[PDB]
Amino acid sequence: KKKWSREKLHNAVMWEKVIRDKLYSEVPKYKVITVSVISDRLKVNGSLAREALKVLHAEGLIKPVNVNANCRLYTRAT
Amino acid sequence: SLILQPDDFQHILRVLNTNIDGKNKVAYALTSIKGIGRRFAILCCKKADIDLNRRAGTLSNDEIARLVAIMQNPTQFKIPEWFLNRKKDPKDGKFSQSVSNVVEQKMRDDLEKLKKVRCHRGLRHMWGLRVRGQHTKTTGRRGRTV
Amino acid sequence: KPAVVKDVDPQKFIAAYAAYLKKAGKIEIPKYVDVIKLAQFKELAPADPDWYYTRCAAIARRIYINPGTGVGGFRKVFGGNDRRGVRPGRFTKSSGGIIRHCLQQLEKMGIVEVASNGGRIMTKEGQRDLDRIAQQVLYPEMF
Amino acid sequence: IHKIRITLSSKNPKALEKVCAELIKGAKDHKLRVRGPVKIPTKVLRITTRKSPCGEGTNTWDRYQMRIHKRLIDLHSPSEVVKEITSINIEPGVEVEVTVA
Amino acid sequence: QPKLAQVIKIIGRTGSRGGVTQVRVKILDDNRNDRTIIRNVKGPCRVDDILALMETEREARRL
Amino acid sequence: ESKKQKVMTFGKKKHAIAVVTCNKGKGLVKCNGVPIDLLQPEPLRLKVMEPILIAGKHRFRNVDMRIRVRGGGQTSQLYAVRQAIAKALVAYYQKYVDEAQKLEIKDAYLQYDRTLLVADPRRTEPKKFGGHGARARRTKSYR
Amino acid sequence: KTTPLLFKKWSSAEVDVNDLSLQDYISKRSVYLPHTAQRWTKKRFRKAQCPITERLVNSLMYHGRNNGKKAMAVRHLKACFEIISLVTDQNPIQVLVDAITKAGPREDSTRVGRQSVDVSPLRRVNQAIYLITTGAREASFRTIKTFPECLADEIINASKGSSNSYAIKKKDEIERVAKANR
Amino acid sequence: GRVRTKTVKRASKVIIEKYFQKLTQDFQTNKKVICEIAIVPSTRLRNKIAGFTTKLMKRIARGPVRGISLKL
RNA sequence: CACCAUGUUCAA
RNA sequence: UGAGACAUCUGCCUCCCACUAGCCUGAGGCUCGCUAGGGGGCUGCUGCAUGCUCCCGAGAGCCUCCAGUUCAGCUUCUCUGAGGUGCUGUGUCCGCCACAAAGGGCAUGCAUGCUAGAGCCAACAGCAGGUCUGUGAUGCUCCCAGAUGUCCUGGGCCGCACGCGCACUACAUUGUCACAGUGAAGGUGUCGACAUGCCCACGUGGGCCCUGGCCUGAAGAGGCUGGGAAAUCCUGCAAGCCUGUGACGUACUGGGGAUAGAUGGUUGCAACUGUCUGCCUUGAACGUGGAAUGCCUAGUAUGCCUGGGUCAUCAGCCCAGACCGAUUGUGUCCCUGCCAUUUGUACACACCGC
C-alpha cells in the first residue's frame, strides 16, 4: 500500500566490572541522578538504572529528592 | 548487590529449536517459542524453580532442560489441563501443549481434515477467505486497486 | 498511642497486614496460587508471589471499613475495565473464587464471620488484630 | 387509632396539591396526628423518539417527558374515619391508595 | 534590540483576517519621551501595554 | 459535660456535597473518618489543606471539624471539602467568637480564593442530539 | 499572614520579572498548588492574573491522550521544578520567569499586505509557555528521558538562552522571518 | 444586548405618568410599588419594567426627559 | 486588479 | 403573525415536608487509648534555637427498620409544590443632523451579568426535498387461488478483484501490565399485549424482570436462599479515567491485538456462514499519516467510563449521564456563506440562468 511519511540503542542488559565500578565511583557525585541520566551516562539498561538507584540509595551514596512514578529524582549525598 | 554478567552469558540460546534472546527476561524470552505464550511462559518459569528476575542468557543447561521438560509435557508438572493448547485434540482425544512448530503442523492437520471433507470452514480456508463469520465486504481488502 | 484503622493510609497498612499473615503462617493458601489470574479481564497473573496476602489484607480492611460486605461487593471492588479487542472497555467483575477463599480462611482464622442478614462482618478479635497492626503502622516506634 | 399511610400520585401537581391539602384539612378537622405531605422525588419518564417517520433530513429528536408526583400522608386514625376523609371526592388523575398496619 | 514602548490609544483592528491591532505607542524609555508612532500588534493588547519594538524606524500606515 | 456548641454547614463543587460539623474540640479535622492527611489524590492534599494553611492551625487548635462527603469525584470532593472547612470555620467564628476575628479569617480567605467561601455555579451542560457532546457535533461529510 | 509557598517549598513572590513589558502579565500570586480551577477564561484578559505556575500545568496536559489531567500535570510540575532547583540553585519559579521572558517572541508576521508586526506582552507569555511546554513534549516522546526531565532541561536552557531549547530556537526563526519581512 | 422592548417601555411610561408621586429612584422599592400597581404575569417582566422605570426616574431627576408628561 | 471555462430536450 | 415575553432544566434563598433522606439524643454493643497537644515560662548559642519545667483538659472509629420531646427529637445536607431573587446592580468612560436618547465597553459587587447558561416552541411563502415500506391515512392503477394474499421449511439481506462515508482501537514511558486505594450521575426493573404459553413442583401452587447474601468452579457460569411494582431491594450501583507502589527500558517492544487453532459455558425451538462469552495458543498492519477536510469558545474541547433505546441473546450505534478538565480568541469579512440598502442586467426553470 502507498505510504506517506534513529539508530538503535544497545544498552547493557546486565552489569559489567567497568560500568559497575563507574556507577559506584562517579554517579554518586552527580547533581541530579535519575534512571534516564544513569542509562545515558553509562549506556546501561533502564531496569539496571532503577536497580542501581535503589541499591545506591539503600546503602547511602545518594539521597532521594522526589521519587515517584514519573522522574525519580535522586541527588548526591553530600 | 548489582550482580555482573557471567562469561557464559549466551546472547541467544536455543530452546527446543527456537532462537531465544538472552537479553530479555526469562519469562519473555520464552515467549519466542511458538506455542508457549506469555502466561504459559510465566507458569513454566514458576514450575521450573526458575527465578523470573534473571535474564535468559544466565540460564544454564539444567535450567533450560528442566524448563523444556515442562514446555513439552506440562501436565506432569501440575499445570492444569484447562491451561493447555490442544484441549481435546480430535483424532487423539488427548490434552497437550503444542509447541515449537507442531503448532502450525497441527494447524495444517486441522485444515487438511476440514478440507478433505467439504466443510464450509475448510472451503473458506482453501479459498483464502475470512472464516468464523466476518464481513468480507470492505475489510480484508489487501491492496489490489481496480 | 491510640490508633485505629482509618487513621493510616490504606497502602502501608495493607502492606503490613499482608506481612502479618506471612510470618504467622495461618491462612492455608490454595494449590492454584501460581496459575490463576485474579479477573477474567487480566492479561497476566498477579506477578507478585505474596499477592494472596495482599488480597487477604485488602479484604480484611474492607470488612473493617464496610461491614456486611459480600463476595459480590468484593467483585465490584476488585473488578475493573474489561480488555476487549479494538472494542472499548466495559466494567466487568473480577474472579469471585479467590475472594471466597480468602473470606473462608479469614473466618477460620477468626477474623470475620457471615453476618446475620448476610455478608461478612468483623469479629471482635479481628478488630483487635487490625487495630494492633494499625498501631504498628502508625507510631512505628512503640508498635 | 391505627397507623395509616395515604399515598397520592399524579401527573398533575395542581390536582395533587389540591387533594393533599383537602386530606390534610380533613385530618385536622378532627385532628388525627397527621404527618404532612412527604414529597417523594418526582419520576421523570423520558422518551426520546425521532421526529421523522422516515430516515430523511437532519436526525432530530422529540424529547417527551412525563412527570409523576408522589406525596405521602401518615395518620393515626380509625378505619372508617380515614376512609371518610378519603372518600370526600378526589380530583381526577390523582391515584390515592391507603395502607394500614 | 528592543526599544520598549507604551501604548496610549488603540487605533483599531486590521489584518485581512482581523488579527492585527493598530495601536499608537509612545516610546517610553528610561527618561526619554515626546514621540508617538503607530504600530501593529499580534495578540491581545489592552492599554498601558509596553511592547518591545525590535525596530522603531519604520512605522505602519494607519488603518 | 457535653455542651457541644456546634455549627453545621456544607460545601459543594459539581455534584459532591460535603457536610461539615464544627464542634468545640481540640483540633480534629477528618473527612469521612480518615484524617485530611490521607485524602486521595496525593498531589492535592495541599489543596484540601489550603484553608488551614491560610488561617493557621492557631484558629483550628480549638475546634473539631468532621466532614461527611458524598458525590462528585476526587477533585470535586477535595474542593467541596476545602470550601466546607472554610465556611465552617467562618460560621463558627461568627457564632462563638469575635466578629472581628471572623472578618479577619474571612478576608484572609477572600483575598486568596473566593471559591473557599462562595460556591462555583458551573455544572455540566446537557448533550444535544446530532453530536456527541454539549457543543461538539457529528463529522459532517460533503460527498 | 504568611505567604503561601508553591509546593510549601518555593515562593511565588520573591521572583523578579526583569522585563518591564511582562511585569503585569506574569503573575506572582502565591498559591499552595497550581491546581486552583478559578475560571479565568471569563474575560478577555483575566488569563493574566492566573499564576504562571498554573498556566504551565494546562500546557503540560495537551495531546489527545493527556487532555484534562491536572492531577498528573501537577506531579510533572513538581518533579520539574525540583530538578530545576537542584541543577540551577535559584528559585524554580524565578528561573521559569526567566525562561518565559527569554522565550517569548517580540515580532511575528501576518498577512496584512506577509509582513512583520509586533507581539502583545500577553501573547509573548502565551507563546513562551506554549513553545516551552510543546518543546518539552517532542523531546520526551520516544525517549527514556522522562517528561519532568525534558521540561526541566528545556526550561533551564530557555532561561540561559543556550540556543538549543526548542522554544529559543523557535522564537529565533520567528524573529528571523519577521526581520526578513520588515 | 439588553435593549428593552416596547411591552416594557410603554408600560414604564404610563406607570410613571400615573404614579410619579409614588415611585423613587430606588429599584427595589419601585419594584415593590409596581408589584402592587400592575398585573404583570411574569416576575422577569415585572423586574424589567421596574428597572426601566427607575432609569427613567433617574433621568427625570437629572434633567428634562423628553417623552413623558408629568401633569402636576 | 494572477488565473476562475461549462451546465443535453420538453415540462415547473 | 414572528423576535421578545412565555415554558422546562442548572445555579442562590425562604416556606412546606420526613420510620422511603440525613443527623442528634437516649439504650444497648464492640475495637484502640487514658499518648501527644496547646498556652507558656525558663534555658542555651538582639536574634535564633535546644532541652527542661509549670498549668489545662482522653478521647477516637464504628454497629442497630431499637425509640424520641403537644399522643410531633431536629432540618445543615437530602426530596419538592409554591414563592422569592437580578433589574445589566454600582462606579467610570463612550454614545445622533443643533439639542436630545436608545444603548454599549471596561472595573466592581453579587449565587451570577456572552438574551445569565442550555434548550423548547417558532411566522409568511415555498422545495414538484423524504416517507404510499408506520397506520383500518389514502386516489387512480396492478395482482387476486398455479396469487404480488397468507403461512410454513430452507436460504438471502452478512455474499468479495475494488472505491467511499463514518466510528472503534492503536502506533506507547504525560505509557502498558500487576497489586492496592479513593471514588459519580441520569436512570431501569416482576403480563394491565404477550402468558389464552412453557417449565419445576403437587385436580391445583410456584417461576418468567432487576437481583442481594451463601456455596461450587481457574474462569465463563451454575445451584441454594432472600428483596423489590421500588428515595424502601438490586444500590451508597465500591464506574472508568485518576492516585500510590512494583515490573518493563526506547526494542514493532511486556506497544497493537487483527487473524487463526484445539474446546468450556450461556441465550434461544433453532447458533452452520463462527450470537455473546471462558481458557491456552497464534501475534498482522500501524514507527503520528500526501493532496485534502470536520467539530469546537467554559464545566466548553478532549479523555474516561455509566444508564436507557434496540434486546430471549448480541452496542464499536444513538439518546442522555456524570467524572477529570483545558490551550487559545473576546476579532474579522480574507475564505466559505447569510441578512439589509444602493446599483446593473438580454436572468425569471431566476448564474446549475441566458
Side-chain angles (χ1 to χ4, degrees), chain A, chain B, chain C, chain D residues 2-101, chain E, chain F, chain G, chain H:
Chain A
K1 289 175 174 295
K2 187 63 198 305
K3 292 194 61 61
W4 329 88
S5 56
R6 187 90 174 209
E7 68 275 17
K8 286 196 37 178
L9 295 172
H10 307 316
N11 289 336
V13 184
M14 270 194 295
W15 287 104
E16 270 186 349
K17 183 66 178 177
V18 286
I19 68 178
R20 185 206 190 177
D21 66 51
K22 178 176 50 157
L23 164 74
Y24 275 151
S25 178
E26 169 190 11
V27 170
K29 288 80 183 188
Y30 279 142
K31 212 177 283 175
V32 304
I33 308 151
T34 308
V35 176
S36 156
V37 183
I38 298 193
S39 69
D40 185 36
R41 291 245 177 84
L42 319 189
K43 301 286 98 176
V44 177
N45 191 1
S47 65
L48 290 188
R50 297 205 327 275
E51 190 201 338
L53 282 185
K54 191 63 70 71
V55 163
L56 286 180
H57 161 53
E59 59 95 20
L61 276 70
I62 289 172
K63 95 202 198 73
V65 184
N66 174 274
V67 307
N68 209 287
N70 52 358
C71 170
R72 311 196 174 195
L73 267 174
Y74 288 78
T75 193
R76 55 181 190 254
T78 303
Chain B
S1 166
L2 295 165
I3 63 162
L4 307 94
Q5 59 158 353
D7 300 318
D8 46 315
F9 168 80
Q10 309 186 340
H11 267 248
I12 284 174
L13 306 95
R14 278 190 70 80
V15 169
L16 73 158
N17 303 123
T18 310
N19 304 320
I20 71 168
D21 201 340
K23 306 167 75 64
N24 289 83
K25 308 271 286 299
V26 59
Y28 294 88
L30 261 54
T31 83
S32 297
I33 291 94
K34 271 185 71 91
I36 215 67
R38 81 167 74 155
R39 272 220 60 205
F40 199 109
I42 300 196
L43 186 52
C44 78
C45 291
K46 297 190 100 64
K47 296 302 188 190
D49 194 0
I50 284 184
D51 179 11
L52 298 163
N53 188 312
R54 40 170 158 161
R55 305 292 156 144
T58 57
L59 259 66
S60 71
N61 275 331
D62 64 90
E63 269 97 340
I64 79 174
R66 72 184 69 189
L67 180 136
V68 305
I70 297 172
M71 293 172 70
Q72 277 187 10
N73 44 18
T75 191
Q76 307 143 14
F77 293 94
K78 270 73 76 180
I79 290 92
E81 279 186 335
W82 54 267
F83 210 74
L84 290 189
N85 198 356
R86 291 286 283 222
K87 263 175 219 192
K88 211 187 287 177
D89 194 354
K91 225 62 176 58
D92 289 345
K94 302 305 155 295
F95 296 43
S96 183
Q97 181 78 20
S98 288
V99 157
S100 71
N101 78 12
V102 300
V103 161
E104 77 277 0
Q105 183 252 318
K106 292 276 209 144
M107 179 203 173
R108 286 188 305 102
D109 204 318
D110 275 320
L111 293 205
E112 282 180 39
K113 145 181 290 173
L114 279 161
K115 293 185 221 187
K116 179 177 292 270
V117 305
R118 300 308 187 193
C119 184
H120 173 233
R121 203 174 87 208
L123 270 64
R124 295 294 279 202
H125 272 299
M126 78 193 323
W127 303 329
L129 294 173
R130 202 57 71 81
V131 312
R132 71 175 64 177
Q134 282 91 307
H135 287 188
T136 314
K137 183 165 162 45
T138 49
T139 57
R141 273 304 174 80
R142 198 65 181 146
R144 314 291 197 84
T145 307
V146 185
Chain C
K1 185 181 287 185
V4 177
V5 190
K6 267 186 167 177
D7 289 86
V8 295
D9 191 73
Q11 283 71 241
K12 291 164 45 63
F13 163 75
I14 294 182
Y17 208 68
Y20 178 68
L21 297 185
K22 282 286 295 295
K23 160 206 54 175
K26 298 294 292 295
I27 72 186
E28 297 284 328
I29 68 173
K31 303 183 95 186
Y32 47 72
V33 292
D34 46 321
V35 56
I36 71 159
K37 293 190 287 184
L38 282 194
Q40 82 159 343
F41 58 85
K42 302 312 194 175
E43 294 206 61
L44 194 68
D48 176 42
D50 293 333
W51 68 263
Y52 192 92
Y53 305 93
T54 68
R55 168 59 58 95
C56 289
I59 278 179
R61 186 188 161 277
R62 284 277 159 213
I63 296 300
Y64 191 79
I65 296 310
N66 313 134
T69 317
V71 189
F74 285 113
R75 296 182 72 201
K76 273 193 288 193
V77 165
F78 297 133
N81 222 8
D82 211 355
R83 300 190 184 83
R84 313 150 94 212
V86 293
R87 303 169 285 171
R90 67 168 68 198
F91 173 81
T92 64
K93 293 183 175 183
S94 44
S95 313
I98 194 66
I99 295 171
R100 205 180 52 255
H101 202 53
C102 296
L103 283 173
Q104 293 164 22
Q105 285 163 344
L106 289 190
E107 72 185 4
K108 70 100 179 175
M109 285 175 59
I111 291 162
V112 293
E113 72 268 13
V114 302
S116 57
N117 56 44
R120 293 318 194 286
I121 209 175
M122 191 55 83
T123 310
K124 307 201 302 178
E125 42 270 20
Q127 203 150 353
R128 188 178 185 85
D129 307 329
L130 278 194
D131 274 15
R132 294 288 151 75
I133 300 179
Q135 194 191 355
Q136 299 168 33
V137 171
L138 269 188
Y139 310 102
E141 321 187 309
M142 66 180 73
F143 50 84
Chain D
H2 206 190
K3 271 181 80 77
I4 290 152
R5 166 92 71 206
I6 309 187
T7 181
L8 299 83
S9 62
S10 175
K11 288 176 285 188
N12 191 4
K14 303 295 182 292
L16 207 166
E17 295 277 308
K18 184 174 187 56
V19 54
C20 84
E22 281 190 308
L23 306 174
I24 296 167
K25 170 57 170 163
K28 288 163 175 166
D29 276 3
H30 38 284
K31 295 183 289 294
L32 292 186
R33 200 195 201 193
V34 61
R35 295 194 71 76
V38 195
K39 319 207 184 194
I40 316 294
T42 82
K43 285 158 194 43
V44 183
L45 318 193
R46 306 202 176 77
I47 282 188
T48 308
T49 76
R50 188 166 146 151
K51 286 188 186 228
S52 178
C54 74
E56 193 258 353
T58 52
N59 322 310
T60 53
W61 293 79
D62 284 344
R63 308 192 263 250
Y64 302 94
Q65 290 163 42
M66 169 183 287
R67 303 159 181 267
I68 299 176
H69 312 292
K70 191 184 180 181
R71 273 77 201 258
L72 293 197
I73 299 168
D74 178 76
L75 287 176
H76 296 246
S77 167
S79 57
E80 292 297 328
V81 193
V82 58
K83 195 266 288 181
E84 169 200 35
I85 68 169
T86 293
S87 67
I88 75 173
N89 299 6
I90 304 302
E91 291 276 319
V94 185
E95 299 293 328
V96 172
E97 182 64 27
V98 194
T99 312
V100 59
Chain E
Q1 279 65 240
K3 294 282 304 174
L4 73 163
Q6 182 180 1
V7 302
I8 58 190
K9 162 154 178 292
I10 294 184
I11 281 149
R13 285 272 190 166
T14 182
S16 41
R17 300 102 188 283
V20 165
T21 306
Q22 285 280 322
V23 311
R24 172 171 280 110
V25 293
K26 73 184 190 176
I27 307 201
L28 169 142
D29 307 319
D30 282 312
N31 297 156
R32 197 38 182 164
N33 46 0
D34 65 51
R35 67 181 294 263
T36 66
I37 56 172
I38 291 175
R39 301 290 272 194
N40 283 326
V41 188
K42 188 183 179 182
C45 184
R46 196 185 334 145
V47 70
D48 307 326
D49 277 13
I50 300 106
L51 323 176
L53 287 70
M54 305 310 300
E55 171 263 327
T56 64
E57 285 160 329
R58 185 266 303 161
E59 65 178 356
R61 190 171 88 179
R62 196 215 267 190
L63 294 173
Chain F
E1 178 265 329
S2 297
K3 296 201 278 303
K4 272 173 156 72
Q5 41 172 349
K6 78 169 174 191
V7 298
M8 302 160 302
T9 177
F10 64 91
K12 61 179 57 161
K13 167 166 192 29
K14 293 191 196 172
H15 271 246
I17 311 175
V19 193
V20 55
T21 83
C22 199
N23 273 309
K24 170 189 191 187
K26 63 208 67 57
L28 179 69
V29 181
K30 284 187 156 181
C31 313
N32 287 286
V34 65
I36 55 170
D37 314 318
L38 315 171
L39 288 201
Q40 284 76 17
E42 173 155 4
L44 320 170
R45 298 173 191 176
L46 257 182
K47 177 58 49 182
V48 82
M49 284 196 60
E50 274 191 3
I52 301 168
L53 298 184
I54 303 144
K57 187 55 101 169
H58 196 137
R59 315 268 203 189
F60 282 91
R61 80 152 75 97
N62 263 271
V63 310
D64 265 8
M65 303 278 188
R66 269 162 225 170
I67 322 167
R68 200 269 312 255
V69 190
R70 259 192 185 184
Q74 312 180 349
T75 292
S76 67
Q77 276 182 12
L78 284 203
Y79 277 67
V81 162
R82 76 199 280 268
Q83 170 177 308
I85 280 174
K87 283 196 182 188
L89 183 65
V90 173
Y92 179 96
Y93 270 16
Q94 83 93 38
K95 245 192 187 177
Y96 303 141
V97 305
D98 200 357
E99 188 77 10
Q101 311 180 41
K102 171 253 160 190
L103 284 165
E104 181 154 40
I105 286 281
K106 196 199 198 74
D107 63 338
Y109 277 155
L110 284 189
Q111 280 178 230
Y112 174 88
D113 191 336
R114 191 155 170 271
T115 51
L116 284 154
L117 294 165
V118 190
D120 188 350
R122 296 187 288 189
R123 276 86 171 96
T124 58
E125 294 180 28
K127 177 188 164 300
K128 283 84 187 179
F129 57 72
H132 51 282
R135 311 278 170 87
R137 308 283 78 192
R138 294 173 191 266
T139 315
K140 186 177 285 291
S141 62
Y142 307 83
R143 88 193 62 109
Chain G
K1 194 252 163 186
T2 45
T3 186
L5 302 169
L6 183 63
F7 285 95
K8 287 204 293 218
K9 293 171 172 284
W10 312 294
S11 167
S12 314
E14 304 183 329
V15 309
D16 167 31
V17 193
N18 285 318
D19 199 357
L20 285 75
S21 60
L22 275 64
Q23 296 298 137
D24 282 1
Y25 288 101
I26 280 175
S27 281
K28 296 186 267 289
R29 206 152 92 91
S30 64
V31 65
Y32 288 117
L33 261 187
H35 184 161
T36 64
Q38 301 282 315
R39 206 160 73 236
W40 277 280
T41 78
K42 272 304 174 177
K43 286 226 177 167
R44 191 198 181 192
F45 278 104
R46 259 165 203 165
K47 184 199 42 184
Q49 57 200 11
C50 200
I52 40 173
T53 70
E54 181 163 358
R55 322 187 58 181
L56 206 63
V57 68
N58 315 311
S59 304
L60 295 192
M61 56 210 214
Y62 298 100
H63 292 345
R65 48 187 219 176
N66 291 130
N67 264 20
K69 286 205 218 299
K70 287 291 288 295
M72 191 188 61
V74 166
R75 316 190 292 104
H76 285 62
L77 191 63
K78 176 167 189 172
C80 170
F81 275 16
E82 182 69 67
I83 174 154
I84 277 177
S85 73
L86 269 68
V87 173
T88 76
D89 48 280
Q90 39 186 331
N91 198 31
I93 313 170
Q94 170 57 89
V95 66
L96 173 64
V97 180
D98 297 15
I100 282 177
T101 289
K102 292 197 171 188
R106 320 146 190 165
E107 285 187 355
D108 196 59
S109 186
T110 55
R111 278 296 275 246
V112 162
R114 177 36 68 103
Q115 150 186 348
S116 68
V117 301
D118 296 332
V119 167
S120 297
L122 182 55
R123 181 173 158 84
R124 209 180 308 186
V125 183
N126 289 352
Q127 297 303 322
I129 64 174
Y130 177 89
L131 302 171
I132 294 191
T133 49
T134 56
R137 183 156 310 115
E138 44 103 357
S140 53
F141 191 48
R142 290 176 202 166
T143 58
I144 197 174
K145 207 189 166 74
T146 55
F147 185 54
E149 271 174 335
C150 314
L151 181 60
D153 191 74
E154 198 276 333
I155 283 185
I156 296 307
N157 306 154
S159 54
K160 314 279 197 41
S162 159
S163 50
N164 60 23
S165 55
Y166 177 68
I168 289 299
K169 69 164 313 169
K170 179 79 177 175
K171 165 210 73 169
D172 271 5
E173 68 177 359
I174 295 164
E175 296 181 1
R176 185 190 63 238
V177 311
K179 211 202 66 185
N181 274 94
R182 279 205 212 167
Chain H
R2 258 90 154 166
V3 170
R4 275 74 146 182
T5 47
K6 68 185 186 68
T7 184
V8 172
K9 301 211 209 288
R10 291 196 286 96
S12 305
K13 275 152 193 172
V14 311
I15 278 173
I16 280 186
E17 297 178 354
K18 283 191 177 190
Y19 292 87
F20 178 76
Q21 70 280 5
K22 277 183 106 188
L23 303 152
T24 68
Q25 325 171 12
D26 171 23
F27 167 71
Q28 284 169 19
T29 198
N30 284 17
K31 180 174 74 70
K32 298 297 189 187
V33 165
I34 299 172
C35 83
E36 272 189 311
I37 287 169
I39 302 93
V40 290
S42 306
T43 173
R44 187 189 217 205
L45 189 56
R46 156 164 66 76
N47 291 335
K48 297 205 172 178
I49 294 184
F52 200 73
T53 300
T54 64
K55 273 189 51 178
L56 283 154
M57 293 285 282
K58 288 181 195 192
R59 288 204 296 126
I60 285 163
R62 293 326 170 273
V65 54
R66 182 180 163 274
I68 67 166
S69 66
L70 305 186
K71 188 265 287 182
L72 278 78

